[PDB]
Amino acid sequence: ASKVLVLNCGSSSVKYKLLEMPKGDVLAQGGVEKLGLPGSFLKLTMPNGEKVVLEKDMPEHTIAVEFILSVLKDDKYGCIKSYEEIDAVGHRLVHGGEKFSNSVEITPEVIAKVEECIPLAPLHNPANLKGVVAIEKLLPGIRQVGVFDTAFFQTMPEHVYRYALPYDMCNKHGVRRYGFHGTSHRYVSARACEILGLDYDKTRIITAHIGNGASIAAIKNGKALDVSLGMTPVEGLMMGTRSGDVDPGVLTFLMEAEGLQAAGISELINKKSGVLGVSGVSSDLREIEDAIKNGNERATLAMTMYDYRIKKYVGAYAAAMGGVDVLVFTGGVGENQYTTREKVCTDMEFMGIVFDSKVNEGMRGKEMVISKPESKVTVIVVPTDEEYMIASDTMTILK
Amino acid sequence: HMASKVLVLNCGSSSVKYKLLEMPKGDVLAQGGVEKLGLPGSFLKLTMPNGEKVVLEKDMPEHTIAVEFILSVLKDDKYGCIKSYEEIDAVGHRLVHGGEKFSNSVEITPEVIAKVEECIPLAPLHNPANLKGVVAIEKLLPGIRQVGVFDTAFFQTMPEHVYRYALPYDMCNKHGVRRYGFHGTSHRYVSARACEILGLDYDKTRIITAHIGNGASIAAIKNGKALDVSLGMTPVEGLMMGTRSGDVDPGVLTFLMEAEGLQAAGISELINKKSGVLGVSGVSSDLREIEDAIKNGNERATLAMTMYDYRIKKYVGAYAAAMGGVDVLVFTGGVGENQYTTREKVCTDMEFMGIVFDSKVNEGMRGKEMVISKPESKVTVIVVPTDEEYMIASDTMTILK
């Protein structure tokens, strides 16, 4: 039994959980917000479910992480008596480029390579490293592990990861598909196989991480083959505010027609598009659901579009792998939006899916098979746990 | 059994392709093309009844002079197939873009020209040339009636959840941003022709049609109506092509704009002219030249083709899922009709969705109507060479009835 602190550091945030391993019990969870801004604060969730908001000036990451640690140890809000109870720290690192294929113990050599990947995630990797530096200062001699969002997808072959763009220009600028959500795809694919009694290394898996950001992956015989996200997180599925796949020529057309530059078109496809952009209602699928009940036709259209594009990816990735054994739904939307799951999996008998509509109906947030027993393809809901996956890699590496 | 002769034109900014067809059989009486129209070195190349190509050099600075030369060749004692222009019963035209105004072919009247002019913004380098052909014919052939047949028309049955992009609603509507599709006349012809060959009811069949040429598109046609198509508002979207990228990460485009200091026009040129098979291979946009480079162990050429086949395979899966299954997969176009190795890579390891492929029948099979799935395959896979000119001539005869 060990306690592992798991961090996710952003430009103006630190999200944390403290996990008891190997069970994965959450001892603490919270987040610092508005770090480096006036009115920085920490919000935590107590074991009994109560939310607590603590204001404190936190101008940079070290002071933020120091406050988190003091809260963990507090006699009122805390869950540990001493920092020595924390056995290790695991970090979400966004981008491992072509340098990392798996999680690693953080050494100076590792930090240097993560710094080399900063150009591939310039607004994420620096903050992630600030978290590592904070822990070296505040918990000296504790060992730390880095777990990369991109690493799982480093098995993709060049015919998948290369775009059909000018060869030299792509190579010069490191343009290729990387994928994100890799920690989630890794966790739910392996978890599904354990639940189902299958050998991970002999199974063809499609994993659909549908949240505010959405991605789908093809995992064949234990190695990722393809993923819907690209070099950037705008590609693939329709998302909350991101476009997903769009005609490249539409982008250049809108640049001329609306007088947008690179930055303007980037903001449009990342912030004003997807479910929000079509619906004119919300990026939140629950608010869409409500708007649909009040007969909002644009909200209905957004959801029809959303479901359709997931369905097409399921077909595409089955074709890419030569079949599929397991289809996994995960993420905030995948775990909860049973109507999407139904629309995606119905009329898919031609490729081995027989769906269990009655079991699926109303089914939110549990691990559950939602295909009929006789389905050739098993369809399963697996709530993701990226923090647990990080803690699990941490314990394996530091063993 | 009576016979009409229909001249079918396909006019581009620097070309006029023509065929003269005898209807309703669809027998080709003549075929050729003017190239380098409006440039030094303009010429007409035609195909004799004997099958040889003949090149007639002639200065042709614009479309009317080009069409006049074409007509003089049709009537020539040596090269011709008619004694006089009165033998031409009608003219049909390939018109690229009908926008949301045209769902099927129409007689070209002043009112139709006005509407086709309104669609010029949607195909600014094609529609103008197409109309120049119409004008040339009205000048050169007294009394002649003309019909327009639109590359976009077949796809006007797509539902909004398919044709809308997940972009700001009002901004798309303001600028007419939506999926249109192209090659509609080809998809229309081969889907119907496949069902005729196979004894199937077109209106109850789920069909995937892959028109693989220098431009490449794949379509889902369900129960007699187009449902989806890989080409977008623009012909860059979807499949990897000769010089066009196909689908790419929208964020890669904005990234390259900043990284290489490109504006809209520069990015547009890159994805239309420097990408696709040409861009990856570093060899050619021509798949025969790729094929050769592969034999000489060019690894980039091999890579280009692996990428090309993979993306077609993914669309086949996607559109089967979109339709709830597939009854018939059709290969067509210059590449689809000829590149049997692509067909094999696409259709092998697809038994999970009902395709059992016949590798031996497929091998070296070029340019013929031919089933290439095994008899026991649930899904029929068929090569159907396209005949857009026949489709155009057929619509022409229906309208001018």
Author numbering:
A (entry chain A): 0 to 398
B (entry chain B): -2 to 398
Sentences from the paper on this structure:
Porphyromonas gingivalis, a black-pigmented Gram-negative rod-type bacterium, is a keystone pathogen linked to the onset and progression of periodontitis. In many bacteria, the enzymes phosphotransacetylase (Pta, EC 2.3.1.8) and acetate kinase (Ack, EC 2.7.2.1) form a key pathway for production of ATP from excess acetyl coenzyme A (acetyl-CoA). Pta produces acetyl phosphate (AcP) from acetyl-CoA, and AcP is subsequently converted to acetate by Ack, with the concomitant production of ATP through substrate-level phosphorylation. In the current study, recombinant Pta (PgPta) and Ack (PgAck) from P. gingivalis ATCC 33277, encoded by pta (PGN_1179) and ack (PGN_1178), respectively, were prepared and enzymatically characterized.
The structure of PgAck was refined at 1.9 Å resolution. Interfaces between subunits A and B, and subunits C and D (interface area of ~3000 Å2) received significantly higher scores than others (data not shown), suggesting that PgAck forms a homodimer, with two homodimers present in the asymmetric unit. The structure of the PgAck subunit is composed of two α/β domains; the N-terminal domain (residues 1–149 and 384–398) and the C-terminal domain (residues 150–383). The cleft in subunit D is the most closed, with two sulfate ions bound, presumably derived from lithium sulfate in the mother liquor. By contrast, the cleft of subunit D is almost closed in the PgAck structure determined without any ligands such as ADP, AlF3, and acetate. This structure likely represents complete cleft closure because there is a direct contact between residues Glu32 and Arg285 positioned on opposite sides of the interface of the two domains. Arg91 and Arg241 interact with SO42- 401 in the crystal structure, while Glu385 is positioned ~7 Å away from both sulfate ions.
